[model samples]
Target: SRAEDYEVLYTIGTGSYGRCQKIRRKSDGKILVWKELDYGSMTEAEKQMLVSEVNLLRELKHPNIVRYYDRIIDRTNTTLYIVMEYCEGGDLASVITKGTKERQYLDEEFVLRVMTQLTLALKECHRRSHRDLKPANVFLDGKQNVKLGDFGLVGTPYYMSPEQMNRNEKSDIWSLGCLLYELCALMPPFTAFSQKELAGKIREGKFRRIPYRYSDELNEIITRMLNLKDYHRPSVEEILENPLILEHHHHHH
Candidate 1:
């Protein structure tokens, strides 16, 4: 049970059905994130998914993955509480939004560094057949380290590869492309369009090139990632070998 004297620090973030709060742990005065899940209002499938998230986290451990500390179920309130590592740097979306407004594209070297960490994390998840990969689920730690979060969307529809969207492994690759594009553009491709329009565009194998402001090498990498044909997209391993990524170097003046 949480102590009554515990002070509320701030609201971290909110999701479809839960609120994440930064709480000052009274026992030691340490900061930690607690996700409150309204169990009573959750669908049976959502309940199962939450349970699966717990199980999945228990089995996975990576430096670039958010760490789950504990969970408490308040039977009286019908709420589930999850204690997790507090990411002071927030999610990748927040960073991207800030960079976009500043007219700052993430430096090529830094972007490659983040992508490399993300790639390794995704590789671990893919081994377990996790199909729901998106930018919002990736968090940044205080030191700017990347950590993948939100396992709830794993195995969800639409985020999977076309074949995987149909529940096949081949379809899962589609999500990888989508994830790469999102990271590079700071926006989901084809999202502003209507659902039918988006679907039509995806079906027509449409993907826009990176903005001209981005480096030519970066553009090449994104183009390959956004390749529409499932088989045509490079394998995750192959992507790591791309010259833009493999030869990534930071330039300081």
Candidate 2:
């Protein structure tokens, strides 16, 4: 049954175009996130973008991706409602920022655990050629398990590989490399540099070396992940073979 006039519990988050609200399903008392889009103010192009997002999400199904539940259009108000899985653990950006502020780097073993799962998620997205990959777009479950979310920026150059920057499979790989770097370093590498400077550094294949405290195996994995050239970059299957991931559980023991 569809929920009607559900009470807003609180505001969960805000994005560039809209706000997300936590609401109780009046029929069953279940909680859900309601992303309301102010369609009245949208340009035709923006409206089309939202429609594309809905169609894409409806066709996508993966454990690591947010589950899309329902949608509603209030024609009178020109508002669009998107109901999705409520992620209580919040997004990766919040997690990494908090960790950084606390001066706590994720342990190599823990990092590997998270990255291994993240890699699997990305693999699924890549297999489908999902073009949007960014920290803010990844979420966590109640148990802190990672899940990729927000497909609004798919096929954009911001996250594309050098060759794919114009629209190629390699561009997705570049975004993957960027993501892996963030997971390992808890920050976006070369973010301080200007766009021109960053592009130069990327072309130069320069990346921050892992701290001495990190294990050699961990450093090796990070090195492979940050490789600038798409062809040289490790594939998802190859990344799984990395010692850091292969031996991760044993290290925990």
Candidate 3:
């Protein structure tokens, strides 16, 4: 089918590289996200990132990974429309922010559920790193299940592993730790007024304790994940092997 087969309902978001919209297939009325990447004004570097993102999404398949259905290339228009699964619950970043605004703390099972899915998704990734792992990149379906998305080029300094500052897969583990910490803390573990200061705090590897509502083991796991030394960080397999994470993993299957 061609891109014209879908009708755009409305724009859902805008990123540095392109606009994202909610679209429905005219034939079947199935809803999906259409990320429009316009390369007319893009530099070679930017286009390569777009190409790499599409390439990576093609090979990543898992229950927790976002589904990449199709891509419509408009050669004449210098545009590409990427069709992907739609997550009604939106991104985890917004969910966490809303919970904080309502003074609602997430339950351990909820966080564990997210962790289980994320780790399993990472396991699916293997040697290839998501490169950017943060709450904003994590989507939640209508059922509130985690589905990793936007493996496109991105992240804030707060989630950067000391080594992330190439493709070192361990960097992803550090970012995942940051997401889990933010899930419980309702904020990034390391923060500062400026990039330099933030880098220092992240390198220092210390932060206020998360709410006592969660298990100490979770806190411990978070600590291990944020370890300043990337070499010391746990791999996806190691993370999934933890008793707490493993419990949820078993239940999920």
Candidate 4:
């Protein structure tokens, strides 16, 4: 198997999606993340979907998007190892966790940075929907730059749009709102004791205001993204052009 080329260090994360382990390429000693998927457990339909998703990831090329390096399909063991860039600062989820613990909030400039980067990433991959934009999927490079990762995964209910639950259509804006809200508020915009109640709250589209420290422009953008009507949500291109994000967004090319 091609897996022999990388030294598997330890597991960094695991879920229904499978395990992601830290790895180092033996040849150049390059550290990366190896996403291990159980090929045997997937149905033929699921396998087809996985292959398509993997192909999509391979085609993606953007600074604010996680770089997909290579895939090792081990037919002998029925496993798939996908190598990707390793973000040393971990994920936005960890950053929010630390902020929540310290009773602090991400500054307005940092929020704008995230908004700009993710909007650009979405614009780059406009054909296919991220469908799972959340704090955990937002990886940080320790240089104040964020890269969106974990493509094609299911959206977390707390961040899911009403249409998403109804199987009507996809809406990344809604999830982005939840992620942005967590950054400012140190918590999700909407939460409840039960899943049913949570869904009700999300459908209602009402949540407490973010900390007063953040600008009202930021709050308004979050509200628009979480709008109950999907048609009302701004497109990725629109988000990039918004005053806050546009001003912060730098044109590299």
What alpha-carbon RMSD in Å does predicted model 1 have with respect to the real structure? 4.7
* Candidate 1 TM-score, C-alpha based: 0.78
Which stretches of candidate 1 lie above 4 Å from their native place?
A: 1-7, 26-29, 40-52, 100-102, 129-131, 151-173, 246-253
| Per-residue alpha-carbon lDDT of candidate 3 for residues 1-253, written as tens digits (9 for 90 to 100) | 5888999999999987689999998899999988988889888998888788688777766778878888898889998999998889898889899988998989988898888888877777764534357787888876657888865533346776787552277777888898999999998998788877887787678898789999999898888988888888888878878888755443232
Q: Estimate each model's TM-score.
A: 0.78, 0.83, 0.85, 0.83
Candidate 1 lDDT over 157-215, as tens digits, reads 33434443233333434565666566667666555335555556566665676556668
- How accurate locally is residue 52 in candidate 4, as Cα lDDT from 0 to 100? 87
The per-candidate count of clashes, in order, stands at 3, 1, 0, 0
Among these predicted structures, which one has the highest TM-score?
3
Query: Which lDDT values do the candidates have, in the order given?
Result: 0.66, 0.69, 0.81, 0.81
**Clash-forming residue pairs, model 3:** none
Residue 208 of model 2: what lDDT? 79
* Error of model 4, residue 26, in angstroms: 3.0
Off by over 4 Å in 2: 1-5, 43-49, 129-131, 153-160, 164-170, 246-253
Worst 10 residues of 2 by lDDT: 244-253
Q: What's the residue-level lDDT of 105 in candidate 1?
A: 65
Whole-model alpha-carbon lDDT for candidate 3: 0.81
